[PDB]
Amino acid sequence: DKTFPIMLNGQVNGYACVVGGRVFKPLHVEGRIDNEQLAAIKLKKASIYDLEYGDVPQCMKSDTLQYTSDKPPGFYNWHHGAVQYENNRFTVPRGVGGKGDSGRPILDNKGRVVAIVLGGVNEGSRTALSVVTWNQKGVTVKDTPEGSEPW
Amino acid sequence: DKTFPIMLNGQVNGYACVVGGRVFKPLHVEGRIDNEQLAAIKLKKASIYDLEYGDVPQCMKSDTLQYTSDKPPGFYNWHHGAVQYENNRFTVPRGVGGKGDSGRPILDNKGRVVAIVLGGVNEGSRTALSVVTWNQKGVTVKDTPEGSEPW
């Protein structure tokens, strides 16, 4: 797995992570990408999408496995423990999921990155997030609960 | 000894090596030289010669000892074992001496770099190389066996 922080002013401001099929960088924030191999790659950002085009030589291509439909409620391994929910983002503990750690992938226990967080700072006594994943049939759609800011 | 790979796209494409008297870089291939001290040195390439001018401060000057005439057939320490031949380049093992490792010096067992390889990919069930060294009286001449490509 290659999940890389983004270098801004010599400190971490983002967190770039490569995914199956295409290499991914969260283009919501800026900062020089730490990896030198990615340091010479053109940027392809859409109006609302903040994703890097996959231009890694196909030796290390598809570092991960993408995620299909049929979301279970079960455990998804997160950087800070497992997450367990199905209707929307898991009720992450308070304090966790704040700010400054943009671009963190939530993966299945089977190695299938279910979604990519793009904010969702607080959602009450619990907290869900604003993320993007396949819609129902494999459509890269973002869902943003109200009160969502990059985390 | 300072033998340095050449940095192209953040991976090794060449192999620069400093020699007695003058600092050497194989200018046949390109790529940013890894060493910062060499990163600010002008380039002096001839029509057929791919050698860097020696512009290192004379503190580390003459890192090696050059090689005189009277080639013995004996062992010359190579990056991949010793080499033993006199008429031409040693019958290197098959598979060894392929491509991508340009700029590798062959040294005497006494610390005297007999020649510098500049290709010679394959020469049959054995393999010799295309190299450059003193001719007979100390003349920097290249010999290229037929079927020679940079290695």
Side-chain angles (χ1 to χ4, degrees), chain A residues 15-35:
Chain A
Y15 199 58
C17 51
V18 61
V19 194
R22 172 186 182 178
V23 323
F24 283 43
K25 193 279 201 186
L27 311 179
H28 163 261
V29 299
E30 66 282 0
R32 192 265 316 173
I33 172 60
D34 193 308
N35 195 278

Side-chain angles (χ1 to χ4, degrees), chain A residues 36-37, chain B residues 9-10:
Chain A
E36 79 303 327
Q37 178 183 1
Chain B
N9 302 116

Side-chain angles (χ1 to χ4, degrees), chain A residues 73-85:
Chain A
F75 286 149
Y76 310 96
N77 40 14
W78 171 256
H79 194 88
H80 315 136
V83 303
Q84 169 90 31
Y85 195 44

